[PDB]
Each structure stands twice: as C-alpha cells, then as structure tokens.
Amino acid sequence: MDVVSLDKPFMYFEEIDNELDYEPESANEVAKKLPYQGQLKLLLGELFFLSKLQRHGILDGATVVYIGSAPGTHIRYLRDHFYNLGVIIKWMLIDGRHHDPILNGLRDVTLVTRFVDEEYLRSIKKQLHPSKIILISDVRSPSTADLLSNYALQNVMISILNPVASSLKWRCPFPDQWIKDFYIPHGNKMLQPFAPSYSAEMRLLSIYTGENMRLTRVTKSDAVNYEKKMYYLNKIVRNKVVVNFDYPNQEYDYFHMYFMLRTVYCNKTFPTTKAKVLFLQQSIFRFLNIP
Amino acid sequence: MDVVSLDKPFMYFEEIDNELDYEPESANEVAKKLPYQGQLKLLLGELFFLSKLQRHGILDGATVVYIGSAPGTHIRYLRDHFYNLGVIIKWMLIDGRHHDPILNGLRDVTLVTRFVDEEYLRSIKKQLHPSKIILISDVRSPSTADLLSNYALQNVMISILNPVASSLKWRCPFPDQWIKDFYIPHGNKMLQPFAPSYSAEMRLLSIYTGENMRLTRVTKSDAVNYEKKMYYLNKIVRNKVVVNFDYPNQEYDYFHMYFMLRTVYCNKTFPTTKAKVLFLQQSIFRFLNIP
Ligand SMILES: Nc1ncnc2c1ncn2[C@@H]1O[C@H](CSCC[C@H](N)C(=O)O)[C@@H](O)[C@H]1O
Ligand SMILES: Nc1ncnc2c1ncn2[C@@H]1O[C@H](CSCC[C@H](N)C(=O)O)[C@@H](O)[C@H]1O
Ligand SMILES: Cn1ccc(N)nc1=O
Ligand SMILES: Cn1ccc(N)nc1=O
C-alpha cells in the first residue's frame, strides 16, 4: 500500500513542490473511479469558491451567471445549500444544451438555452443591470486552438459582465501543442480533488477590486511547468494513502476534499470539524447518488 | 493680462483639481500658435518618457518600436540626444506613410513602410527577439469607432510585443459619442504642453514589471470626467501667465515645458536648472525651426 503522513494537502497550484516528466502512457489509464465523479468535482470546487465569497460578504444579493452549466445536476445542491442558509442569490444558467429538470420550477434560478457570444453577453449585462455579478464558467469546445478560443471568450465574459468575482475553467495547453502565448485573468489556481486521474485542469478563482483587471501572460515554458507539476501531483501525490488522516477514507482526494469542506458554512452546529465534514460529504454523496 | 503664481504645473491628469462644462464654441478657436507645434508636442513628451526609462536603467540596449512614426521629424532630435549621451538604442520606425529623409542613413534606425496588423506584430516580435522592447505609439485612423479600434490595436501591440515600457496616444471618447466601455493599460497620464488649444489628448506611460499586464476599464462617466478636467485645464489653466516664473516666457505651457525639460540629462554641466532648460529649449526650437 502507498502510505504517507501529510500536514495539509496542496490546495493551489503554486503549492505543488515537485515535478515529473509526463509519461504519455498515463493517458491510457483509468481516468475515473466514481460514478458522477465529474459532478462531484465541480460541486466541491464551486462550493469552496462560493463559501469564500460568502466569507468576504460578496455573495448575498449577487446574481451568479454560470455559462456552460448544462446538465448542471450538482448546481441544484449548491443552490439549495445557500438558499437554506438564508443567503439571497439569483442563478442564471446559460448553455446551448439542456439542463437537468431538477433545476426547473425554482423562482431563483433562470435557465437559458443559448450558446453565448460577445453580443449576447452585452444584452445580458444590460438586462442584469444593476445587479452584482459572480461569473462561473465551465464552457467546453480539445485542440490548443479550441482552448485558446475558450479562454479568449472567458476573458470577454469578464470584460463585458464586469463581475465582482469569477471561477474559470483552466487547463494550460500542452507544450508539445503550443501555438502562441496568451493572457488569463490573475487568480488563485484552485486544485480539484476527484478530477480525472491525469487531468491537468484547475479552477482560476478571482475577486475584482476597483475598476482594474489584471492579466498574466502564459508561455510555453509555463506550459512545461504546468505539465510537470500536474503530472507529479497526479502520478505520485493523489496516489497516496494519508495514514495520519483519521477519517473513514484516507485516500489523498478525501484528505483534500476534507480541507475544502471544512471552509463550508452549515446551519447545524457540530462538536468538531470532522463531524461537519463527514456530514457535508455524506450529504453530497447521497445527493449525487454516489455510494 | 491673465496673471498668476504657481508652485508647479499639472504634470499628470490626476493632478487637475477642477472642471468646467465643455463649451462647443471652443472648437472654432485657434488650435495652434506655433509652427511645427505638433512635432514640439511629441518631442517634449517622448523626451520626458525616455529620460525616465534612462533614470530606471531600462533604456540602454533597448529597441524602440515606434508605430505611427511618420513623418517623424522630431524623432531625429530624440535619436541624436540619446546617441550623443552614449546610450545604445536601436530605433524601428513603422508607418505606412513616408518618414522625413533626415532619418535616413543611420545604422541605428530602421524605417519600415508598413501599416501594422496583429500578424505583422508577431513577425517583428520574432525578428526583434531577444531584444528588450520599448513601445511608442502615435497611430491615427476621428469617430469613437476609430478611437476604440486604435486603442484595441495598441493593447495588441503590448500583448504581442511584450515591451518593458510603453507610451501610448490617449484621448478618451467624448461622452456625447459614447459607444461602449473598454480597457486601456494602466499607466501615468502625462499631460502635454503645446497640445492644440482644446485638445483632450494625453500620453499613457507604462512600465511593465513581471509577466503581468494590468488594464483599467473606461466608462462614460470617466469620459465625462476627462472632458471637464481637460476643458478646465485648456480654457483656464493653459491661459495663465505664471508671473512668478522668472523665465524668458512666462506662459503656462513654457512653465510646464520647463518641468519636463529639467528631468532631461545633458553632457554639458550647468550652474542651474534654469540654464540647462533654456539650453534644451533653445536647442529644441532651433532644431524644429521654431522662432
Ligand atoms: N458559448 C457557450 N455558451 C454556453 N455554454 C457553452 C458554450 N460553449 C460550450 N458550452 C457548454 O459548455 C458545457 C461543457 S460541460 C459543462 C458541465 C456543467 N458545468 C455541469 O455542471 O454539468 C457544454 O454543456 C457546452 O454546451
Ligand atoms: N496600423 C498602423 N501602423 C502604422 N502606422 C499607422 C497605422 N495606422 C495609422 N498609422 C499612422 O499613424 C500616423 C499618425 S500621425 C503620426 C505623427 C508622427 N508620430 C510624427 O512624429 O510625426 C500616420 O502617419 C498614420 O499613417
Ligand atoms: C495530461 N496530459 C496530456 C497530454 C500531454 N501531452 N501532457 C499531459 O500532461
Ligand atoms: C475637445 N472636445 C471636443 C468635442 C466634445 N464633445 N468635447 C470636447 O471636450
């Protein structure tokens, strides 16, 4: 068994302290071990991001514009959690595909069947006005050309919508498929427990102060670094059994999940963080129909 | 006579401490009083910007890419000044129009007859590599549509060229001709002595640290502020005779010019700043054939 003792898990990309040459043979390996793992992956990250905004007092009264939201099964859980906490939020879910019918019939959630373009962002900006906007993007076209195009659209989401905060899907193009340098919004690169086995994807979390928009250039050398740091995390770290983690499941991803869930606010009071987390996890798994 | 006593002149936009409702009747007023005033305007500003970079140690060894450089008569002076100071700089002057023949035959200055597009910026970036780039832009199409297009191209100049510093032409669209909000690079808004009488144009000066690129959104309300602050500066301030300015010319613009010229480095040593300035001004006016 691959056992180890850890203080805390890597919460962000910059914390990863080692790298490994990527082995293309990893791509043939089992990418997922849990049913609805993709919904779980998104639920934990967005729960984490949104609880943070709540902590900063910027969630209550906002309209969350989630683009690339379908099917969005896990969004129903997120919606219930804050709604039950008393936070007032309006949800605007836009995608060209159809959403899970569990999202229907809620006065606080508007579902829109539209693939967004810059022109549309403008009309929704005019229509949402003057509400404060929190952007969550998970759009998907893939080629580096597809990626660049997605990232370019995500930056236009921010410039037109002018949100108070944002969570953007982020995976650096692979160096062996580099095309050209580009810019992405400055933010914290949140690492995702339950991501596919060899995924190099993370979520870029940003909070916009003032009327400024800070960007950061991404080069091929950055791409090489992303690849190696993520490969190390995937191949070595995520394969660890944190034996000093006294919890029903000691696998790295559960240890990592624990740290995200501990930042989540509940109505029910617990004697320990362990008890809150076990509760949130149970609740989450029951909702997604995960054993 | 319109007399007054001033400590220092408004060097940057943020320093302007008052505003005036714009009077459209001002547009019919004499815009210029000096021959080659436009070359003078540009020479003082670029001399100021470049002396600053020299002060920060970022000029020597750089390649200055000046887009929208033709005719560029005043550029010959700038080139001689630094060349005679011992600073090593390569100049790359790109415009679709023709440059003043005085710029020909200098091994350190390359003239290019090309209207730049994003694709071209890419090839020159590959060709300049690995030299450090200082961008100066003075391109001109005008309608707000023309302006936005120019500003959009200027931002692409920075993203592709990735310069160590930049000086960009900047005049906010007029509120009564607003189209949409947009972003411009963060920088100091340098005010221009000898600009036309009612010009609202300034020069955006930026220095790029790290791999970050900070932008700032510009709204119609910002546009209203630009208009009023600039109208106040033009109608009231620039029309002042700074009587406590003991100098051959006490008009506001000369007082303002004095402050820019005092930051300029010379080989010759002077007993006083007044003497250096009088010298630099004389030299500049003689060069441009201004009485
Ligand atoms: N321009 C665009 N506007 C909106 N959605 C888009 C888009 N381009 C792609 N998409 C959507 O991006 C989605 C990627 S899968 C998204 C899963 C979703 N976040 C969930 O929680 O289940 C697809 O549904 C796709 O239709
Ligand atoms: N894409 C482009 N590339 C280069 N120059 C451009 C351009 N679009 C416009 N211009 C140039 O912008 C200039 C504006 S006038 C510039 C005057 C010059 N700075 C001097 O010191 O005399 C024009 O010469 C125009 O041809
Ligand atoms: C995950 N992954 C996939 C392809 C590739 N070239 N590198 C990677 O790190
Ligand atoms: C200079 N200028 C010109 C036109 C206009 N509407 N406002 C101005 O301040």
Is there an atom of ligand 3 within 6 Å of A198 CB? yes
Task: Answer for the pair A138, A68: CB distance below 8 angstroms, yes or no.
Answer: yes
Show me where chain A is broken: residue before each gap, C-N > 2.5 A.
141
Residue B81: phi and psi, rounded to 5, are -55, -50
Angle between the N-to-C axes of helices B144-161 and B118-128, in degrees from 0 to 180, rounded to the nearest 10: 30
Q: What is the 3-state secondary structure (H, E, C) of chain B?
A: CCEECCCCCCCEHHHCCCCCCCCHHHHHCCCCCCCCHHHHHHHHHHHHHHHHHHHCCCCCCCEEEEECCCCCHHHHHHHHHHHHHCCCCEEEEEECCCCCHHHCCCCCEEEEECCCCHHHHHHHHHHHCCCCEEEEECCCCCCHHHHHHHHHHHHHHHHHHCCCEEEEEECCCCHHHCCCCEEEECCEEECCCCCCCCCCCEEEEEECCCCEEEEEEECHHHHHHHHHHHHHHHHCHHHCEECCCCCCCCEHHHHHHHHHHCCCCCCCCCCCHHHHHHHHHHHHHHHHCCC
- Nearest Cβ partner for B213 among A162, A180, A215: A215
Starting at the edge strand that comes first in sequence, how are the strands of the sheet with B182-185 ordered? Answer: A182-185, A212-218, B212-218, B182-185
What does residue B77 show for φ and ψ, rounded to 5 degrees?
-60, -50
Q: Determine the Cα–Cα distance for residues B11 and B258; give it in Å rounded to an integer.
A: 11
CB proximity list for A16: less than 8 A, separation 6 or greater: A10, A191, A229, A230, A232, A233
What is the CB neighbour count within 10 angstroms for residue B86? 8
Inter-residue contact A138 to A69 (CB < 8 Å): yes
Q: What does the alpha-carbon distance between residue B142 and residue B144 come to, in Å, rounded to a whole number?
A: 7
Q: Cα–Cα distance between B54 and B6 in angstroms, integer?
A: 29
Non-local (6+) Cβ contacts of B152 within 8 A are: B182
Question: Pick from B54, B153, B63, B45: which is nearest to B110 by CA?
Answer: B63
The strand pairing partners of A206, in sequence order, are A166
What domain range includes position A185? Answer: 1-291
Mutate to test the pocket of ligand 4, among B21, B174, B236, B238 (most ligand atoms within 8 A of CB): B174
- Strands A63-67 and B188-190, by their bridges, are unpaired
Integer Cα distance of B156 and A272 in angstroms: 53
| Crossing angle between the packed helical segments B273-288 and B37-55, to the nearest 10 degrees | 130
Distance from C-alpha of A254 to C-alpha of A40, rounded to nearest angstrom: 12
Residue pair A260/A274 in contact by the 8 Å Cβ criterion: no
Show the tokens assigned to A213. Answer: 């928009």
Both tokens of residue B204?
């955006």
Show the tokens assigned to A23: 């082995």
Of the candidates B26, B11, B12, B14, the one whose C-alpha atom is nearest the C-alpha of residue B236 is: B26
CA distance A72 to A143: 24
DSSP A136-197: EE------HHHHHHHHHHHHHHHHHH--SEEEEEE-PPPGGG----EEEE--EEE--TT--T
Sequence length of chain A is: 291
Write the CA distances from A19 to A194, A230, A253, B53, B94, integer angstroms. Answer: 20, 7, 19, 38, 44
Cβ–Cβ under 8 Å, residues B113 and B96: yes
B45: closest CA among B249, B232, B257, B239? B257
Structure tokens at B173: 């669209």
| Cβ–Cβ < 8 Å for B74, B80 | no
CB B162 to CB A212 under 8 A? no
Using the structure block, give the residue that is written with the tokens 């609740």: A283
**Mutate which of A19, A198, A225 for ligand 3 pocket (most atoms within 8 A of beta carbon):** A198
Please state, in angstroms and rounded to a whole number, the distance separating the CA atoms of residues A37 and A81.
20
Cβ-in-10-Å burial (0-12, 13-18, 19+) of B214 comes to middle
Bridge-partner residues for B135, per DSSP? Answer: B65, B166
Distance from chain centroid for Cα A125: 23
- d(Cα A205, Cα A49) in Å, to the nearest integer? 7
Long-range contacts of range A108-112, CB-CB < 8 Å, 24 or more positions apart?
A108/A79, A108/A83, A109/A79
Token pair 């191209």 in the structure block, residue:
B153
* Residue A180, min C-alpha distance to chain B (Å): 10
Q: What is the rounded CA–CA span in Å between residue B153 and residue A112?
A: 34
Q: Which two tokens stand for residue A93?
A: 């879910």
DSSP string, chain A: --EE--SS---BGGG--------GGGGGS----STTHHHHHHHHHHHHHHHHHHHTT-STT-EEEEES--S-HHHHHHHHHHHHHT---EEEEEESSPPPGGGTT-TTEEEEE----HHHHHHHHHHHTTS-EEEEE------HHHHHHHHHHHHHHHHHH--SEEEEEE-PPPGGG----EEEE--EEE--TT--TT---EEEEEE--TTEEEEEEE-HHHHHHHHHHHHHHHHTGGG-EETT--SS--BHHHHHHHHHHTT---SS--SSHHHHHHHHHHHHHHHHT--
Q: Does the annotation mark A268 as catalytic? A: no
Report how far residue B168's alpha carbon sits from residue B158's, in angstroms, rounded to the nearest whole number.
10
Distance B14 CA to ligand 4 centre (A): 19
Closest C-alpha to A235, from A55, A42, A23:
A23
Cα A140 off chain centre by: 14
Phi, psi of B175 (to 5 degrees): -45, -40
Nearest to A262 by CA among A181, A193, A173: A193
- Separation of alpha carbons B220 and B218, rounded Å: 7
Say how many residues make up chain B.
Answer: 291
d(CA A136, CA A127): 18
**Chain A residues touching residue B211 (CB < 8 angstroms):** 216-217, 219
The alpha-carbon radius of gyration of chain B (Å, integer) is 19
Q: Count CB atoms within 10 A of the CB of residue A122.
A: 14
Number of domains in chain A: 1
Q: Which residues of B17-42 are buried (b: 16+ CB within 10 A; e: fewer)?
A: eebbebeeeeeeeeeeeeebbbbbbb
Q: How was this structure determined?
A: X-ray
Considering only CA atoms, give the Rg of chain A. Answer: 19
| Rounded Cα distance, A155 and A215, in Å | 9
Q: Looking at beta carbons, which residues of chain A come within 8 Å of B185?
A: none
A67 C-beta closer than 6 A to ligand 1: yes
d(CA A218, CA A7): 31
> How far, in Å, is the centroid of ligand 4 from the Cα of B184?
20
Among A247, A234, A242, which Cα is nearest to A281's?
A247
Largest CA distance in chain A: 57
Quick one: residue A262, left, alpha or beta (phi over 0 = left, psi -120 to 50 = alpha)? alpha
Contact A216 B217 (CB under 8 A): no
Query: How crowded is residue A107: how many other Cβ atoms within 10 Å of its Cβ?
Result: 6
- Of B174, B156, B176, B177, give the one whose Cα is nearest residue B166: B156
What is the β-pairing status of strands B133-137 and B165-170?
Answer: parallel
On whether the CB atoms of residues B212 and A186 are closer than 8 A, the answer is yes
Under 8 Å between Cβ of A175 and A218: no
Q: Give backbone dihedrals phi and psi of B92, rounded to 5 degrees, phi first.
A: -130, 105
Cα-Cα end-to-end distance for chain A: 23
For residue A89, give how far its alpha carbon lies from the nearest alpha carbon of chain B (Å).
26
**Region of B274 on the Ramachandran plot (φ > 0 left; ψ -120 to 50 alpha; else beta):** alpha
CATH of the domain at B146: 3.40.50.150
Q: Among A217, A220, A221, A225, which would you mutate to test the B interface (most chain B Cβ atoms within 10 Å of its Cβ)? A: A217
- HSE (side-chain half, CA atoms, 13 Å) at A49: 30
